From Swiss-Prot, chains A, B:
Disulfide bonds: none
Compartment(s) of residence: Nucleus; Cytoplasm
Naturally occurring in which organism (per UniProt): Mus musculus (Mouse)
Gene encoding the protein: Nfkb1
Protein name (database record): Nuclear factor NF-kappa-B p50 subunit
Purpose of the protein: Constitutes the active form, which associates with RELA/p65 to form the NF-kappa-B p65-p50 complex to form a transcription factor. Together with RELA/p65, binds to the kappa-B consensus sequence 5'-GGRNNYYCC-3', located in the enhancer region of genes involved in immune response and acute phase reactions.
Residues recorded as bearing Phosphoserine in the entry: S91
Per UniProt, location of the Glycyl lysine isopeptide (Lys-Gly) (interchain with G-Cter in SUMO2) cross-link in this chain: K79
Parent-protein residues present: 245 to 350 of 971
Amino acid sequence: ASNLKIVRMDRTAGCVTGGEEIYLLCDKVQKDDIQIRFYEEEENGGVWEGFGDFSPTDVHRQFAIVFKTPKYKDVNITKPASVFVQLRRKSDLETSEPKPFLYYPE
Amino acid sequence: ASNLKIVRMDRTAGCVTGGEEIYLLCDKVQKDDIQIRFYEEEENGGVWEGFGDFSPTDVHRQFAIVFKTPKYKDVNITKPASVFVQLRRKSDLETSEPKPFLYYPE
């Protein structure tokens, strides 16, 4: 929808160890009721999830968030791991349409 | 000032040939009355200037602009060339406090 929406991200891939800064342009969000969720449906095993590292201060005028990537689940991957990133409102867990994110082996 | 203000840029260096995408978080600006100016006071020789490549569509809700870097003046530099980037309102040529930008040799 447009409520929560990732307009564009400056990085769509990142080192498996996480900790990398990303500029994410989004539709209006509340700095204190927003988290960036990286996740991967582990199919039969469920769903892995990691959250972008940032504070309300990194939410620029409610239309962008500069954050750092979470460490992927398996920091010893041999080849790229495809996950998803979605904006998610903390209160009611509302979600944006996901964006593909590639985690690459260090 | 705060009128025009570059809050943060995801890249502060770039290839001398230009054409590189940068996410720039800024204070409120008007998508049709804004340009991103890269410049270098050529001291005795004056001032070199290049403008970020983008259209009003790349101005995200008046608080960010995704643009591409201009080609530096000397595309054959042997070592990093320091310039400045400032937001500049097209109409009255109002300016933001500059941000250091490093152009590196291809």
